[PDB]
Amino acid sequence: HMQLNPESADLRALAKHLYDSYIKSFPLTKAKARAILTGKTTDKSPFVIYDMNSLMMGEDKIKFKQSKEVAIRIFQGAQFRSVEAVQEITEYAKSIPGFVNLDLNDQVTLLKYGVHEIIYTMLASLMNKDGVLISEGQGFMTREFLKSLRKPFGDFMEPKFEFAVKFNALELDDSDLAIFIAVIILSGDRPGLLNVKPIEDIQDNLLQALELQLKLNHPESSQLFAKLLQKMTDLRQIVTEHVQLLQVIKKTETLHPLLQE
Amino acid sequence: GLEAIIRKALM
Ligand SMILES: COc1ccccc1CNC(=O)c1cc(C(=O)Nc2ccc(OC(F)F)c(F)c2)c(Cl)cc1F
């Protein structure tokens, strides 16, 4: 027996507070990515990079914010956008009720071990079966073109696509994702945390909020909550293979302006 | 490195 009582209304307020904060922190929402990807927007159409000639034109006509290998220039671009995503996700984290009242070293640990899992979550919002929106929607790079880059770069995006295909089938919206990303950030099992109970307490409240959100928003998926928790298990391991691959590249191949200052 | 950006962004 679900009920509209003060407890539920507080979970809906928490859900709305997180959604609003999500909208401020991440200008390219899933609703907007979906409008661009499905050509259901009046907005300027993205430039498609589907081969080497289309990439060369792309560097010219997609403006972002040298190295003679195409594959390295692409990977570096991904690494710079990842840095930017860490800033926006930290900004988002600050808006989660209880997060800035935690020991700063724990705040750093939560974000240190979480941002990769959130990047792969939010990347899914920008992907379909054909590829991924780049430069906040000015560009679209195809899955197969990324795959065609010489080793070890050809496989850097594949596991994100594998994850995204199955994650996007759950049809989550920005309201669902905002709560989901907050559950990830407040994970009490990160290594090196001083004070666990206060983190689990916020996560408990976030879990209740997420559960209510998915029940209200997804009438034809009675165990979507259990499905989303299963995806946090996936994500941890995807991040394991990502981290392990970034080792190889850094020590087998020859730095963002914020990382200099 | 990651910590650098997180620490600055949190302030
Ligand atoms: C200038 O070099 C190039 C030339 C031609 C094409 C391209 C580049 C330079 N490469 C890229 O821009 C490039 C960037 C990305 C990327 O990771 N984007 C991205 C979006 C949103 C994020 O936030 C998160 F919260 F969702 C996020 F963390 C990351 C990807 Cl997959 C592939 C790319 F080829």
Contacts of A107 in chain B (CB under 8 A): 10
d(CA A143, CA A49): 10
Contacts of B6 in chain A (CB under 8 A): 86, 90, 108, 111-112, 115
Residue A24 burial (10 A CB sphere; 0-12, 13-18, 19+): exposed
Token reading at A10 = 């507080």
Give the technique used to solve this structure.
X-ray
A 86-125 residues with CB < 8 A to B: 86-87, 90-91, 94, 100, 104, 107-108, 111-112, 115
Report CA Rg, chain B: 5
Q: Look at ligand 1, atom 15, and give the residue with the nearest C-alpha.
A: A78
B 1-11 residues with CB < 8 A to A: 1-10
* Contacts of residue A26, Cβ cutoff 8 Å, sequence gap at least 6: A88, A92, A122
Say how many domains are in chain A. Answer: 1
Residue A172 burial (10 A CB sphere; 0-12, 13-18, 19+): buried
d(CA A110, CA A191): 9
Shortest Cα–Cα distance, A258 to chain B (Å): 8
d(CA A121, CA A168): 10
Token reading at A101 = 């009242």
* Contacts of residue A156, Cβ cutoff 8 Å, sequence gap at least 6: A75, A78, A146, A149, A245, A249
Select from A91, A108, A259 the Cβ nearest to the Cβ of B7. A108
Residue A150 burial (10 A CB sphere; 0-12, 13-18, 19+): exposed
d(CA A145, CA A199): 42
| Test the B interface: residue of A89, A92, A111, A261 with most B CBs within 10 Å | A111
A101 is in which domain, residue-wise?
1-261
> Residue A155 corresponds to which amino acid?
D
Q: Which atom of ligand 1 is nearest to the CA of A73?
A: 2
Phi and psi at A54, nearest 5°, equal: -65, -35
> Residue A196 corresponds to which amino acid?
V
Resolution (A): 2.2
d(CA A103, CA A124): 31
Residue A57 half-sphere exposure toward CB, CA atoms < 13 A: 12
